Amino acid sequence: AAHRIALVNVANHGSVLPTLPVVSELARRGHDVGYVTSPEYAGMVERAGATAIPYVSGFADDDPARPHLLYLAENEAILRAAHAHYGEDAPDLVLYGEVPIIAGQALAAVWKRPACRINPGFASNHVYSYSREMIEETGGVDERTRGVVDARLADLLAGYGLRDRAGEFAERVEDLNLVLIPREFQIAQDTFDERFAFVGRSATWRPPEDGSPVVLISLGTTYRQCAEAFAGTPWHVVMALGPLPPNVEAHRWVSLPAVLEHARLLVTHGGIGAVMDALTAGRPMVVVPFTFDVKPMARRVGELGLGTVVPAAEFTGARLREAVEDLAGDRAALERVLRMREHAARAGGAARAADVLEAYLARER
Numbered sequence: 001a002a003h004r005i006a007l008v009n010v011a012n013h014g015s016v017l018p019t020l021p022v023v024s025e026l027a028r029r030g031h032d033v034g035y036v037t038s039p040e041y042a043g044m045v046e047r048a049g050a051t052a053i054p055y056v057s058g059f060a061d062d063d064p065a066r067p068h069l070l071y072l073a074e075n076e077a078i079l080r081a082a083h084a085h086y087g088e089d090a091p092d093l094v095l096y097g098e099v100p101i102i103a104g105q106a107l108a109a110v111w112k113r114p115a116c117r118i119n120p121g122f123a124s125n126h127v128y129s130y131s132r133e134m135i136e137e138t139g140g141v142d143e144r145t146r147g148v149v150d151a152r153l154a155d156l157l158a159g160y161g162l163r164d165r166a167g168e169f170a171e172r173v174e175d176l177n178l179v180l181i182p183r184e185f186q187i188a189q190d191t192f193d194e195r196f197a198f199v200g201r202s203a204t205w206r207p208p209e210d211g212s213p214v215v216l217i218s219l220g221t222t223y224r225q226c227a228e229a230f231a232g233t234p235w236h237v238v239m240a241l242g243p244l245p246p247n248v249e250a251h252r253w254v255s256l257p258a259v260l261e262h263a264r265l266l267v268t269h270g271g272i273g274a275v276m277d278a279l280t281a282g283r284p285m286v287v288v289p290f291t292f293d294v295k296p297m298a299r300r301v302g303e304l305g306l307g308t309v310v311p312a313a314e315f316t317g318a319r320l321r322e323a324v325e326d327l328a329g330d331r332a333a334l335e336r337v338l339r340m341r342e343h344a345a346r347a348g349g350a351a352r353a354a355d356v357l358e359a360y361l362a363r364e365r
Contacts, residue, residue: 006036023265064145305336
């Protein structure tokens with residue numbers, strides 16, 4: 001019937017924003033969702049239909065162990081808020097993000113409850129692992145750093161009598177995983193078994209009236225060469241970032257899905273949220289990967305022929321203008337993107353995610 005869900009997640013846009021349609025679907029079906037989040041995202045998750053569970057947390061600085069210790073501190077802070085909020089009456093399911101996996105698994109073990117991981121982007125297994133690729137890009141781990149982190153993890157789990165489970169919590173694959181991308185976009189997709197549900201994602205501005213082709217440019221946290229590149233061209237350029245030609249439009253923030261309804265191409269930094277937006281809109285994209293985290297997405301857009309990858313080292317105004325006009329007139333790419341849009345629509349979205357989560361709790365797994 002109506003279940004109790006503890007949605008345990010880290011509090012940032014990339015983690016919280018994609019989970020909100022799932023929260024809404026569950027809430028609409030009458031499920032009591034408790035969202036462990038920070039006070040800044042508390043109103044956001046409550047407007048989505050959840051009950052906010054706030055969490056707040058406050059040696060060396062250059063230390064390579066510092067990011068891992070802060071990660072464990074956040075996992076501890078999350079774990080404390082959830083455990084204290086529910087107390088004696090445990091929820092029916094532990095829905096946790098692909099970042100607080102120590103907190104999520106500890107809670108599930110303590111409460112003796114089924115758990116489910118939420119992967120907004122790529123899912124990881126023995127064949128492909130977005131985490132293993134991420135760890136190497138962040139420089140990997142030395143033996144000294146491994147010892148520091150391995151101990152503080154065991155110390156963290158000791159307070160819940162789970163010290164002997166540090167190894168599995170860090171390495172194991174969850175019994176169920178909601179993956180917020182279509183199966184067809186996933187790297188080594190045919191290797192992902194029954195434990196992964198590829199449900200994809202569920203879903204003010206006026207365009208030029210003359211009929212000018214529109215290109216949306218939304219890159220990272222890095223806006224002059226782009227405007228100078230499309231100057232004198234028939235393109236209408238919509239730019240997002242935090243002297244312009246008449247055809248170039250600039251805004252601090254832009255609704256990517258709203259503009260993509262009128263634009264034929266997206267110039268993106270490679271974020272899975274933006275890639276998913278283009279895919280849902282059926283628009284090819286030009287990916288410029290400035291950060292390491294988007295490198296798998298950039299590689300995947302390229303190998304599926306859903307767009308063009310311009311390396312950050314090779315990026316100039318001219319190369320962008322060249323990539324945009326080349327990919328815009330490419331019928332082959334457009335057909336592949338529209339086909340990928342059908343896959344994304346067929347994924348099931350938040351409605352199927354809820355159907356999957358209900359099926360899981362029906363003691364079917």
